Symmetry: D2
Subunit: 243 residues, 4 copies
Amino acid sequence: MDIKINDITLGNNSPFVLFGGINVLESLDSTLQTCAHYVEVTRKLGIPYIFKASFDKARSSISVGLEEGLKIFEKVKAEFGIPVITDVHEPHQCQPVAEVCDVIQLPAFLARQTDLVVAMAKTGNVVNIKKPQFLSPSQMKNIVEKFHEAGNGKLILCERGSSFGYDNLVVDMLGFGVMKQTCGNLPVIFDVTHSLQRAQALDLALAGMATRLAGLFLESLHLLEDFLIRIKALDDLIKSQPI
Amino acid sequence: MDIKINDITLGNNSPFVLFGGINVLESLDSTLQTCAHYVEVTRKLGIPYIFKASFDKARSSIHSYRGVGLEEGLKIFEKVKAEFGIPVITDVHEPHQCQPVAEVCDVIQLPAFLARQTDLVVAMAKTGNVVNIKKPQFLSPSQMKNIVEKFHEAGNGKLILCERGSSFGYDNLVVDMLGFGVMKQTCGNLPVIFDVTHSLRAQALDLALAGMATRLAGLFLESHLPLHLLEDFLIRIKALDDLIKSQPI
Amino acid sequence: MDIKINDITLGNNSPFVLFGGINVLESLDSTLQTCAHYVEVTRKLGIPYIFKASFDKGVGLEEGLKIFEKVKAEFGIPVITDVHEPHQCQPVAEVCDVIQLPAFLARQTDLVVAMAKTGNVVNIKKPQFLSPSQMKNIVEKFHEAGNGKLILCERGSSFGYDNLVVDMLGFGVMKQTCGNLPVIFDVTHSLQTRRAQALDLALAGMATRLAGLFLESLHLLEDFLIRIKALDDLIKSQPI
Amino acid sequence: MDIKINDITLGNNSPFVLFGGINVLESLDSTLQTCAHYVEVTRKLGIPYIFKASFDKARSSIHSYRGVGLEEGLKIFEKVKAEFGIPVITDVHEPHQCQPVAEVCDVIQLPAFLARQTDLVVAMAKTGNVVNIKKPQFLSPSQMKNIVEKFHEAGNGKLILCERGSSFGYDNLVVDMLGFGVMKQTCGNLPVIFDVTHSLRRAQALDLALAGMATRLAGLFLESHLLEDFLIRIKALDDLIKSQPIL
Ligand SMILES: [Cl-]
Ligand SMILES: [Cl-]
Ligand SMILES: [Cl-]
Ligand SMILES: [Cl-]
Ligand code: NA
Ligand code: NA
């Protein structure tokens, strides 16, 4: 199943879409500068692009938030004409965030919170569902089920690694196919950035994209360019072969 | 460090406290009947007892009943306290809930999945209430100190640390019995309690006895084990706890 | 199921047996020194005791087996050692009451068969990568090769990289699926990924009701065992 | 570091080499027939190929056939080499097997369960042959350097590291795609190959094999027109990856 995000087509048999941006919105000018760089690189390589940012470091020490965050996203969308993606944490956030942000993201540790699931679904926006670090990939079916029961089928599934002992993550490359097979071939994307815990990012990205995926998260010599050239070469090859 | 909870002393070298009750508040009379059975059995055996329930929580389907909700839940907690004279514990998900819940409930509980969330931590801290911190299944025991430090910074030192197992492959939990000691040593010997119900019956008994062997402040369980085998179960736990606690560290 | 080892009754509802000794036999005099201490401590505590040692990581099988014979003569206790080769099993088992399948060799069917054939009691070291519900597959093999006198020895489970964790639920899974054969707990291996830690882990494991405790390890052993004995005595006095 | 295995160049920046064949040797006829299929497919695609089989090993039942044994097994290997002109690989379990096996078999393989058995390591090293070290599922990739050091101390540096997956809770194996790089960085860029079969459906094996090979590896190891379609896909990805300069 493909999802149309403005003029972008996202699907497991389409050319991969890059999701990327900043960890957390600090200011308008630093956001616009970061987004400009991604746009420039993706444009010249011909890779579709969706800008990503959080308005919150929710876990940091006692060390811009919603209304100002949305203002910045509005400007990003005006200047560059691309879609954006952000995370939501509470039901009450969903409708106002969804008014501006094309894709809204369910954090992996909140995936069981059915009140947030309902509030997200109700917006009718495209939703990115991050897989919990503890969950079998065949269990993503059950979260997909909830969204469908809540009346939203515009769903993206997002790998971010699995718990591996204490304080470590491994990515099970078999999980991609399991999610595609059990969840009706919804777009599957790979959060490489959060899976890592640094040519390691490139190895990981390439291994994941070798399984035939809709897209990838990457965080930004011209390292981003160098990575994307290689990922695009691999993606183009894989997508040119019959499934 | 011990924590006083009304007349109860909670401490890693005190007689274990039972935190027990039900999953979600659904009905007043049913709550009172279940609580009555806990109270009756714990009184019979001389075990300190704190009644547990959730007023609002996610279930396995989007429309399964989440509980009576905050306003009716606190009314039910009030009736439990008035009838039985015992402390109660409940969880919260959002900062706005922290004050109204803390006014009524003796212990407030930070769900394991929210335990790294700063805004909720600060809001819970500022109630001044005793707080039960559930250890996320994806967190190492030496990292509990980071959560404790946030609470300390925000002015609240009355903290309990609650084990509920660690992710082990897919869809599975193991409880590291060494984690208890790591939490004691790294978090200033705050009370450590063991949620055997969510760490998973012959099983619950084995796992409870193993955990309590390491010398813990308390045991945390839900029933709907089977309610009637509670006395059998608690007899064995109290036996072990009394033996362990009666020997010097 | 209980197993008789000479005068000892080994079983999940009998008083726990200690397996303990030295890593590798280096000399006769040394062996007798370490063993005498274990015997002296355990005798006064009333804890049945089986002396454990390897004959090669040191002195080799020829010298090793003479040493073991001397231990048995002097002290009158059973002994336990690992075997690595099918040919070794018969000669070793003439002397050593219990013979041990190393964890790394657990899938080596020709050793299993050669061990079974001796009719000796066998200690099966559970690999850290084997689940407790798969131990029944090793037990199957020994049963088909005609030997049912098996002890299952827990050593911890792989937990991410390097680290080990002991699943306290695995003890019960092994009892239920392997016909309640004696289960013992190698607390030491489980740790080498310390005094206070070994005590907590040993107490926790023995709280699940086990046949024995297995150590790869001013009066630390005696004081450790007092505590373990107290727990065990309590647990074993409770109806199952 | 590359390794020359007759006319084959094995290394992390060379075209991938296929290792595969049969589980245990039974007869000359049976062996030649399976090996012929591998040879035909790999020759048709221009993929270097090393035939694999065991002469003697444990099975999943105590009375399953362990294989034809050392003497007849080596006779069969000799004939595979003469008939097809390819290198072969087999595992050894005992120091005393190492010399005669190494007389015939181009690569000798250290089973994962024996990875830390010093006396076998030494005996394997002393043959001077190319050695394949199977990485235990309970050993981390940074632990492989210790095995490598043993071999080096015993005088043999012609070593391949073979990934097989890692223990992941109960029963499951996961392959850490990051472990390949760790092994290359810590072990002097010795050839690393991927045993995709133990690591575990054709669909599944394909995904996993492609993922591993995307990290840039010396070879692919199978414990076993289907093989053709599979290899066509692996070669496509390998050729692409290998054709680009290392970043
Ligand atoms: Cl709870
Ligand atoms: Cl959790
Ligand atoms: Cl041992
Ligand atoms: Cl292995
Ligand atoms: Na030669
Ligand atoms: Na040679």
